[PDB]
Amino acid sequence: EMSPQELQLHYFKMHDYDGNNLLDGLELSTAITPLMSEDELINIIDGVLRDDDKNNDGYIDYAEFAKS
Amino acid sequence: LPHRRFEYKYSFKGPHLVQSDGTVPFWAHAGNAIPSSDQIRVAPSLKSQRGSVWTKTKAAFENWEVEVTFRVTGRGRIGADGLAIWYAENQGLEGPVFGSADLWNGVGIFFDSFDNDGKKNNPAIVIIGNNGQIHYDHQNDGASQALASCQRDFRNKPYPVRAKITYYQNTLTVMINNGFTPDKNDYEFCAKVENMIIPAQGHFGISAATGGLADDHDVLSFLTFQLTEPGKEP
Ligand SMILES: [Ca+2]
Ligand SMILES: [Ca+2]
Ligand SMILES: [Ca+2]
Ligand SMILES: [Ca+2]
């Protein structure tokens, strides 16, 4: 099995479908998804960007994802 | 150097483009628009087809950039009718303008593959501003109305064609990646409109249609970015 660090990178790249080592809101959508209302989907993704995305570029990189 | 912020709420892409229930999240499709998981076939190679995909809410960005990736494919050396990329005040869900409403308030960038006025100047890309009052002149391929234009054969290309449309400091710029290489950053200048006014708030959109002739109109992705001037904050 994986170390805690190897597990973090693993779940970071799990929805990095374009392989650019950055998580965008659409890639998050796919992670988050009968179906929830589109308003609750926006609220969640928005919350994640507001919490994780420090340089406000609409992406979450590994550093932002991990914290430490 | 302008700050670039990705906006997921006004975007869509592969490889999970559609949701389990057939919707593109945050986008409305209409007419005969078909979303699947890797592309949206906006207008199929069937007769007199009309399709559009527009955003569900208005973007309020003073500066923006959209990158649209697409294929226009047809069995012949002449196809029809073409594809339109929009920023407008209202959703133009259905209508006669490359698949959507006429008399739009804003800008439509038309990728015109059909030479309706026989001027031998197609496929072409034309930028057409509108204020809610002008009818699109499709019999002259908008030549009486065009703010700027270029000649690009955007049909049947080895790789997806890309359009980069930038609205920055009042200037609307179109760059085209003509689909000859797998390098997605090989853009060439198409057209420029200085001092352009478009509404403060609008829907982004994409639409297609076919005539007697009929090309397949596939959009692989629509990527929207907010632009901030050096000195401000997003
Ligand atoms: Ca990514
Ligand atoms: Ca970031
Ligand atoms: Ca023409
Ligand atoms: Ca035409």
Side-chain angles (χ1 to χ4, degrees):
Chain A
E1 253 207 61
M2 287 157 279
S3 67
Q5 279 172 352
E6 293 170 327
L7 274 157
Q8 289 218 333
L9 190 75
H10 176 79
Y11 281 83
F12 176 72
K13 288 174 157 280
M14 185 179 278
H15 305 283
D16 172 34
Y17 306 104
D18 63 9
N20 75 344
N21 298 316
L22 303 156
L23 297 174
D24 64 56
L26 292 179
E27 289 174 328
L28 295 170
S29 305
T30 307
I32 311 182
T33 50
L35 184 78
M36 65 165 63
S37 65
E38 239 186 48
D39 318 89
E40 194 185 349
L41 185 61
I42 288 152
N43 170 276
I44 288 167
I45 300 155
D46 282 0
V48 184
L49 293 169
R50 221 172 32 244
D51 290 345
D52 287 0
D53 175 38
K54 296 302 176 163
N55 63 345
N56 207 27
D57 68 347
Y59 295 104
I60 293 160
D61 60 35
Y62 189 59
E64 281 168 338
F65 182 76
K67 272 81 176 173
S68 315
Chain B
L1 290 182
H3 191 243
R4 284 245 293 172
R5 183 187 191 258
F6 182 77
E7 305 284 332
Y8 79 83
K9 202 184 309 194
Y10 310 97
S11 307
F12 73 70
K13 60 169 161 172
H16 303 270
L17 207 158
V18 76
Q19 272 174 302
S20 55
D21 76 339
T23 57
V24 189
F26 330 120
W27 291 71
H29 60 134
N32 320 323
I34 289 318
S36 65
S37 40
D38 57 3
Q39 55 195 345
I40 306 177
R41 180 154 279 160
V42 191
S45 45
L46 306 165
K47 274 178 182 73
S48 55
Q49 291 301 302
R50 283 172 183 184
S52 54
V53 198
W54 290 77
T55 60
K56 282 183 190 194
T57 72
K58 295 196 224 288
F61 304 142
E62 297 178 303
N63 306 305
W64 51 258
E65 191 165 267
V66 298
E67 310 183 51
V68 185
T69 304
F70 67 93
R71 292 196 171 278
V72 176
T73 323
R75 300 195 206 189
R77 220 147 208 217
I78 318 164
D81 274 311
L83 156 137
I85 300 166
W86 308 89
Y87 176 82
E89 186 203 334
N90 296 300
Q91 286 172 186
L93 282 178
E94 199 100 59
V97 187
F98 287 87
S100 51
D102 205 356
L103 314 171
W104 67 94
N105 188 16
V107 57
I109 301 88
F110 298 156
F111 293 75
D112 197 323
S113 60
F114 191 74
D115 186 9
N116 280 94
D117 55 0
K119 287 226 141 50
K120 315 274 190 165
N121 62 348
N122 295 67
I125 305 151
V126 39
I127 296 163
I128 303 182
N130 205 333
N131 47 38
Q133 304 214 239
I134 306 146
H135 299 268
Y136 175 64
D137 184 33
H138 54 3
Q139 291 305 132
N140 280 350
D141 293 326
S144 42
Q145 293 156 163
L147 293 180
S149 55
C150 72
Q151 300 276 293
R152 287 307 199 274
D153 181 18
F154 51 83
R155 284 179 79 250
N156 304 319
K157 299 270 102 69
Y159 303 90
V161 176
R162 306 173 57 85
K164 201 175 72 190
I165 302 159
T166 305
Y167 183 68
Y168 184 60
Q169 301 189 325
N170 310 119
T171 304
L172 187 76
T173 308
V174 186
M175 305 281 297
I176 301 292
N177 176 3
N178 212 185
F180 280 112
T181 69
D183 175 10
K184 65 155 168 176
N185 291 306
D186 190 0
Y187 282 107
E188 285 156 355
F189 177 82
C190 164
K192 206 197 181 162
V193 184
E194 302 197 332
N195 305 310
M196 177 156 203
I197 290 167
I198 37 103
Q201 294 177 14
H203 300 291
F204 286 103
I206 191 149
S207 67
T210 61
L213 307 162
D215 270 344
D216 284 287
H217 305 272
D218 303 309
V219 59
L220 277 62
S221 57
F222 191 102
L223 298 184
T224 296
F225 298 81
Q226 189 189 348
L227 299 173
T228 306
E229 270 156 73
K232 294 195 171 188
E233 299 187 343

